[PDB]
Amino acid sequence: AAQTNAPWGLARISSTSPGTSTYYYDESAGQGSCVYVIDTGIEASHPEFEGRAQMVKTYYYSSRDGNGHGTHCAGTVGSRTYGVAKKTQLFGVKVLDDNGSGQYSTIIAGMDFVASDKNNRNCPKGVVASLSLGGGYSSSVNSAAARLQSSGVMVAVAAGNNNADARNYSPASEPSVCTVGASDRYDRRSSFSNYGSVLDIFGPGTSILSTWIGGSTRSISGTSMATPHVAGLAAYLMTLGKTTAASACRYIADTANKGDLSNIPFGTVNLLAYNNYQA
Ligand SMILES: [Ca+2]
Ligand SMILES: [Ca+2]
Ligand SMILES: [Ca+2]
Ligand SMILES: [Ca+2]
Numbered sequence: 583a584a585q586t587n588a589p590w591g592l593a594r595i596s597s598t599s600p601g602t603s604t605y606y607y608d609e610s611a612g613q614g615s616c617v618y619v620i621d622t623g624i625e626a627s628h629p630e631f632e633g634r635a636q637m638v639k640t641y642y643y644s645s646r647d648g649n650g651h652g653t654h655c656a657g658t659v660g661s662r663t664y665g666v667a668k669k670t671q672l673f674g675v676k677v678l679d680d681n682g683s684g685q686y687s688t689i690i691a692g693m694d695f696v697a698s699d700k701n702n703r704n705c706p707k708g709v710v711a712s713l714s715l716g717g718g719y720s721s722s723v724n725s726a727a728a729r730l731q732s733s734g735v736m737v738a739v740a741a742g743n744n745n746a747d748a749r750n751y752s753p754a755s756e757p758s759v760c761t762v763g764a765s766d767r768y769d770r771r772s773s774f775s776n777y778g779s780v781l782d783i784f785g786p787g788t789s790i791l792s793t794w795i796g797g798s799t800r801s802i803s804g805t806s807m808a809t810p811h812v813a814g815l816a817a818y819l820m821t822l823g824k825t826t827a828a829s830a831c832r833y834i835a836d837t838a839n840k841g842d843l844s845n846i847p848f849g850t851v852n853l854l855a856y857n858n859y860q861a
Contacts, residue, residue, distance in 0.1 A: 583609040584861065589664055590767040591786030591811055595855050598839065600769045606859050612667025612817035615707035617659045618696045618735070619810070620689070621652025621714055622682055624674035628653065630661040630793045631672060638703075639695050640676035641688045648680030650795045654802060655714040657793030658810035659817065664792040664799070666814025666857075667821070670710075673703065678715060686723050689715065693726040693753075697733035707821040709735040710830075712813030713753055714806035716742040720752040727753035736820070736830040738762055738813040740805035741776035748776035754805075755780050760816070760831035764788060764808040765854055770844050775805055777850040782831050784843055785811035785855045808855075815855050 585592065585605040592605035618638075625647045626635040635656055637645035647653040652674060660670035677692035678684040693711070700709040711730055716739070717723075731737045737759035741748040748754040754761050754776060761780050764772035764787020771777065772787040785808030792807070794800045816830040825833035838853035846852045 583607050589791040591790050592666060594786050595666060595811055595815055596857050596859050600767060606861050607818065607857060608822055608859060610821050612660060612670035612821045615667065615817040615821045616671040616673055616700065616703050616705035616709050617667065617813050617817050618673045618675055618709065618711040619652055619656040619659060620675045620677055620692050620696065620711055621655050622649035622678040622680060623647035623652045623676035624656040624672060625653045625795045626674065628793050628797050630657060630663055632662055634660060634670065635672040635674065637674040637676065638699055639692065641691060642676055642679055645674070645676050647795050649678065649682050651678065651682050651714065653795050654792045655712055655806060655810040658790060658807055659712055659814045661793045666811055667817035670817040671705065686720055690723060690726040693730045696735060697730045700735060708827045710813050710816045711735050711737050712810045713737065713739040714809045716740050716751050716754050718752065719750050719755055723752035724756040727756040727759045731758045734827045736760065736816045736827040738809050738816060740809045741781055743774040743804050744776050745774055746776055747778035748780045749778050751776060760812060762805060762808040762812045764805045765843055769842050771846055772803065774803065777847040779849050781850050783812055783834050783838060783851070783853050783855055784808065812855050815857055818857060
């Protein structure tokens with residue numbers, strides 16, 4: 583399948599080169615795989631989710647997405663226009679309030695919710711979680727991402743937008759989960775992108791067009807938008823039976839566009855997410 587005039591990120595994860603704008607993908611498109619978007623929530627009712635999105639959990643008065651952050655990450659995962667896995671099921675888990683922030687105890691409770699909630703969902707192709715959130719190191723938050731991963735969910739986490747080593751951030755610093763750095767359309771490390779030995783992969787991060795609240799669209803930049811690209815890819819690759827929840831991050835890194843990114847700190851992997859799809 584070929585989506586002409588796609589966002590630059592989708593086009594890049596189906597490309598050996600930068601500078602193309604056609605997303606190529608197997609028409610299976612992650613069907614029968616679930617991606618949990620742990621975030622501000624999702625506006626499930628966006629015409630771009632075609633009813634494949636629903637809120638399954640909140641730790642606030644409303645499960646709505648008043649923020650947009652989580653509606654925009656869900657979108658990069660499995661929206662029809664701006665998604666990687668255009669047929670995946672999206673489960674919104676609102677750990678972040680509409681200001682975009684949350685307590686670490688609530689985020690932990692959300693990760694543990696998914697590790698269990700998956701046993702209440704039809705995900706025959708497997709389960710993915712996209713954590714586009716982060717803060718300082720916390721062995722407690724790391725251990726929650728570890729558990730979620732260990733429960734048989736491919737965990738993709740932002741490195742963090744601090745332009746520092748991700749070793750000092752959670753759940754970015756957790757060795758067992760997929761830590762995603764950000765790249766821009768010219769294959770440069772996004773100026774904001776965290777780096778280090780803990781990083782496993784890069785996704786498109788800078789100027790990422792996706793879904794927004796009010797049934798709208800807008801472009802926003804972060805490791806937070808790299809993550810849903812990787813999250814999406816893992817969903818896609820799992821539905822193709824090309825990898826599993828446990829070994830997805832490794833598989834993505836084995837099959838990645840190597841050496842293609844500039845301004846990658848020595849000792850950080852030079853690996854851009856690649857679907858490796860041949861039309
Ligand atoms: Ca674009
Ligand atoms: Ca987000
Ligand atoms: Ca976002
Ligand atoms: Ca987002």
